[PDB]
């Protein structure tokens, strides 16, 4: 009865995807793929400052 | 998109309406399902005056239900809230959108005028003027309108 999350988010994952939406979104994610070395233990370590 | 803009603009009065004890979460959510259906039908191409009219009719019935609900559940003629004028403001917004999209339909223009005049207690003498100015400019050779 309560396993999956009832209300998803279209910008990320559509259970309903017309072929054109799917391919367009594929190119979208391909553009914005994160660099491999961004993977770290704390996903905020990009922001800070040092000199 | 623009539908998202309209829905979020609708949120706060919904917040107020649930906050005051006269609409349950589920009922309000159903109301928003219907709202979203209408919003997409207007925004998407191929829409028609029938869609605008049905949207208006649904909202008017919601307003009536809200009025009777506040009459019954707390026996107050008028809550000093945001909603009580929010629904009619949205109806006016619908009329304006419909007429800016189909300035041809005399029947819709006339529904607009009848609504605004009949609710004329709170409305503007000036607002009737503006509607009539715009209509006359668009259809100068309608002696019926004149």
């Amino acid at each position: 009865p309560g396993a999956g999350e009832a209300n998803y988010d279209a910008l990320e994952l559509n259970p309903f995807e017309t072929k054109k939406q799917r391919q367009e979104q594929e190119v979208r994610t391909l553009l914005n793929k994160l660099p491999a070395d961004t993977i770290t233990l704390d996903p905020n370590s990009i922001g800070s400052v040092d000199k | 998109s623009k539908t998202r803009y309209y829905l979020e603009q609708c949120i706060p009065e919904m917040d107020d309406l649930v906050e005051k004890g006269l609409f349950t979460k589920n009922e309000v959510s159903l109301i928003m399902k219907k709202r979203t259906d209408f919003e997409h039908r207007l925004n998407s191409r191929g829409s028609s005056i029938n869609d605008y009219i049905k949207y208006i009719n649904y909202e008017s019935n919601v307003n009536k239900l809200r009025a009777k609900r506040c009459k019954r559940i707390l026996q107050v003629k008028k809550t000093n809230s945001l909603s009580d004028w929010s629904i009619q403001q949205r109806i006016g917004f619908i009329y304006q959108r419909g007429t800016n999209k189909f300035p041809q339909d005399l029947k819709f223009w006339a529904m607009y005028l009848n609504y605004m005049k009949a609710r004329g207690n709170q409305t503007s003498y000036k607002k009737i003027h503006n509607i009539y100015n715009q209509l006359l400019k668009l259809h100068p050779t309608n002696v019926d309108i004149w």
């Binding site: 209300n7 | 917040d15 979203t36």
Partner: protein, 50 residues
């Protein structure tokens, strides 16, 4: 500014499209783990049963 942002997120929450589903007893004699997949399929919607 941050607080304005999170209040906006909460309003979106009023705007969500659906609702999670649950499973509760109503009672004390019977317990949840005693239900059977046949019982659920009988008691629920045909799209899910399919």
């Amino acid at each position: 500014q941050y607080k304005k942002a999170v209040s906006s997120a909460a309003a979106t929450d009023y705007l969500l499209p659906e609702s999670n589903g649950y499973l509760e007893p109503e009672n004390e004699l019977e317990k949840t783990f005693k239900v059977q997949q046949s019982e659920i399929k009988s008691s629920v919607d045909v799209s899910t049963a399919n």
